[PDB]
């Protein structure tokens, strides 16, 4: 059935038809929506296999080639064989490609063609994941010139010897539970910064301490690594307009490299599969410094921006909010290192997504992970009708490897 | 069954029963979402489950349930069905209903006012003029000098869907919108089409910015008439900054009252087609929305040029300053004239606490995420870290067609 989408803002209608192929179910029912919850065999290896397949080959214009239907025929032995299969190098590019093309939390796709792979699927030790992740970081940090990228370890077999990283990003700053019951640094990762500790990191207790590694491969206890200094870009935060701000002493990390989500493509699951791109302002200077439960940094900005914070209705927070979302653009830009802002990121998904609808025939997308945690309203999506379903290739959701691990 | 929502910022998580009780679809598949789509007579035979499901609930809630009051009730309103197809609601349900089709408007995040509602029943109306009347007497009671309360008048329910009662109105108070030979627009953009049919229809339009519309009524089914709101019935706020002495020069002002008057309430089963409510503004509904949306007043610009921003990348946030700035300005003002309104901080927080209370005392609040949290500074306000569930319960506040593209002329 044909579905269609509109944006109020401007009246185009888009119409989608791509939603026909979704295969995992979005957690709904035609009684309850469920938009807003944060996360609602050989024989099952085949169909997924060939569904796989048959996209691969359809997108490179030889659907039904006597080289599909050999790789086809191929794939189909070795699973009844080997119980799974491998991947060629051009498969794990597409499927790498079309888990981010169909991440439809991402605002970002529209670079979801360039993305640089490297299959780290030759991998057989922590110490060679670190090699590997080391190289991915300072590949894609590219001295301040952000490029996406994504490193591939060994694919899922047993489920006992399974490639994690225990990280949930590559670059994270460390969290410490303090004696006041207050919390230094983020508390985002207190936890985490705990298990580091409770291996042999030595935890400088500082406000913005870089996390260590901590890699897992074949099923193996979890080791940790520094990650060398000089390849850890860090932006110092300062206003425009504010000398005071340096005062505030903030600074974030240029790389978000995504690190405890895994990949699946045709069937086949990589748990660990280190992803990455650059920075929308919003997420450091809205989320990640004004969230409450994060470095909750609202109050002190307002004091020393000198105004009202006795009433609500002065809109103190708003106007703070935004200040310090002006210092963090300000300060990626001024020492070159690549950010985008939601007002620019926003109005190029829309370009995208009215791509996608023309070659694709639809783009799923969340709205409201994809609307920004400030000035919703002025960004183009915000008026923009989304369709939200799962495609694969995939990037999903994967419990914590602590909480499953067989030490 | 039991449904599970979580809030990340408190890690309070809370149990939904109340969707068992959900029964019209919500647009949405086991294989799609339509989460951010704005919108995805009766017979006898179907009729009577509804008013036996609407009086069980009634009764239930005086806990008379079972009661001989109750079983005579269902007695009385069966035969009444059978004999005349439809029936008539007592004052007491009438009262009840009307509340909970508020209650259950998961896109209202005010509904922590639910139960302080003032209803009038005007299903002794016959005419326009007579509607006039009616609405008039709502806006003075509701508008109450600026300290506003909320209120909502009842005309007439549907009977075989050729003598509906419309108010051909969006909103009991709007501003004109004009459209130039020109191509640009005067007034208000997403009144254009609404203003030209008040023109046809007779209207002399002032053809100003902030020009207030007149009211188009439809009784009984008959073609609609015009009448003007009594000027000092109609609340009216000038914008001005607390600290920008230039932003009262950008000649801004807005009407205090929102009264919604083109939606559908249904009751047991009943339509009514005309029902205007009202409540009070929320800032950022104005300030973000009707000031700042490309497609109505569109003031950004203006406010960021007189602002001297840097407006030469978007990067410098210029548009997100001056927006704060504009929405500062409407609460400041509204609270100077001693109108009430309420700003997006304390609106949502309110939620949240009567959310809580709800799923308590009800087992549930079905809430729309996308509608509910504000179209500003969203994650600084408690709603964006909160999980909802959305489902439909009636009684219930419904969209309904345009009446110009249905009405059949006389
Ligand atoms: C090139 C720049 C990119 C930008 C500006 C961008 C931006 C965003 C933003 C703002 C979010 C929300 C993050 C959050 O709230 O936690 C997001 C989500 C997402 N992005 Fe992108 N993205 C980019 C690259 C990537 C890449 C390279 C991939 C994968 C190959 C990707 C995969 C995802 C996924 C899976 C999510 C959702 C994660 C979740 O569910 O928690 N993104 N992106
Ligand atoms: C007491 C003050 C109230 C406040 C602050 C409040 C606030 C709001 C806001 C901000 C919206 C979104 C409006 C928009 O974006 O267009 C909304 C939606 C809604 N409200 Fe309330 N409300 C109040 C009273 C009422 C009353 C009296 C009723 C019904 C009796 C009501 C019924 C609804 C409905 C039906 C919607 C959704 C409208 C739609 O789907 O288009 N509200 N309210
Ligand atoms: C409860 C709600 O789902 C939650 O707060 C979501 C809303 N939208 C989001 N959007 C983005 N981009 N990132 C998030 O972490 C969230 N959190
Ligand atoms: C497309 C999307 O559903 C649309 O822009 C919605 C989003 N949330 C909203 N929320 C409120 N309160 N009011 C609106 O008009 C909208 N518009
Ligand atoms: C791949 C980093 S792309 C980015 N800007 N941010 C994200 C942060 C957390 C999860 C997903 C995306
Ligand atoms: C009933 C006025 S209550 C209010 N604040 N605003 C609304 C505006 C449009 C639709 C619904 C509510
Ligand atoms: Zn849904």
Redesign the pocket.
């Known amino acids: 059935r044909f579905l269609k989408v509109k944006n109020?803002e401007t009246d185009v209608v888009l119409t989608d038809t791509l939603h026909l192929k979704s295969t995992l179910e979005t957690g709904c029912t035609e009684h309850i929506c469920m938009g807003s919850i944060m996360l609602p065999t050989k024989d099952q290896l085949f169909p997924l296999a060939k569904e796989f397949l048959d996209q691969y080959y359809s997108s490179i214009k030889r659907f039904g080639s006597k080289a599909h239907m050999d790789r086809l025929e191929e794939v189909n032995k070795e699973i009844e064989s080997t119980s799974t299969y491998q991947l060629k190098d051009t498969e794990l590019i597409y499927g790498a490609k079309h888990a981010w093309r169909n991440a439809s939390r991402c605002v970002g796709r529209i670079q979801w063609s360039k993305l640089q792979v490297f299959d780290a699927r030759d991998c057989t030790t922590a110490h060679g994941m670190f090699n590997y992740i080391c190289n991915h970081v300072k590949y894609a940090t590219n001295k301040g010139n952000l490029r996406s990228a994504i490193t591939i370890f060994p694919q899922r077999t047993d489920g006992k010897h399974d490639f994690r990283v225990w990280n949930s990003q590559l670059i994270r700053y460390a969290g410490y539970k303090q004696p006041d019951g207050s919390t230094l640094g983020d508390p985002a990762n207190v936890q985490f910064t705990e298990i580091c500790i409770q291996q042999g990191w030595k935890a400088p207790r500082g406000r913005f301490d870089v996390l260590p590694l901590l890699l897992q491969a074949n099923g193996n206890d979890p080791e940790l690594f520094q990650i060398p200094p000089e390849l850890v870009l860090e932006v110092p935060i300062r206003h425009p307009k504010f000398d005071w701000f340096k005062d505030l002493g903030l600074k974030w990390y240029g790389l978000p490299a995504v690190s405890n989500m895994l990949l699946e493509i045709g069937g086949l699951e990589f748990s660990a599969c280190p992803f990455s791109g650059w920075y929308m302002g919003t997420e450091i200077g809205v989320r990640d410094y004004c969230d409450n439960s994060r470095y909750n940094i609202l109050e002190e900005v307002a004091k020393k921006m000198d105004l009202d914070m006795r009433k609500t209705s002065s809109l103190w927070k708003d106007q703070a909010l935004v200040e310090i979302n002006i210092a963090v653009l300000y300060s990626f830009q001024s020492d070159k290192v690549t950010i985008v802002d939601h007002h620019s990121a926003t109005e190029s998904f829309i370009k995208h997504m009215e791509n996608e609808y023309r070659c694709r025939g639809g783009c799923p997308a969340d709205?409201v992970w994809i609307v920004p945690p400030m000035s919703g309203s002025i960004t183009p999506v915000?008026?923009?009708?989304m369709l939200n379903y799962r495609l694969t290739p995939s990037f999903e959701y994967q419990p914590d490897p602590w909480n499953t691990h067989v030490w």
């Open positions: 109020w709205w915000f008026h923009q009708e």
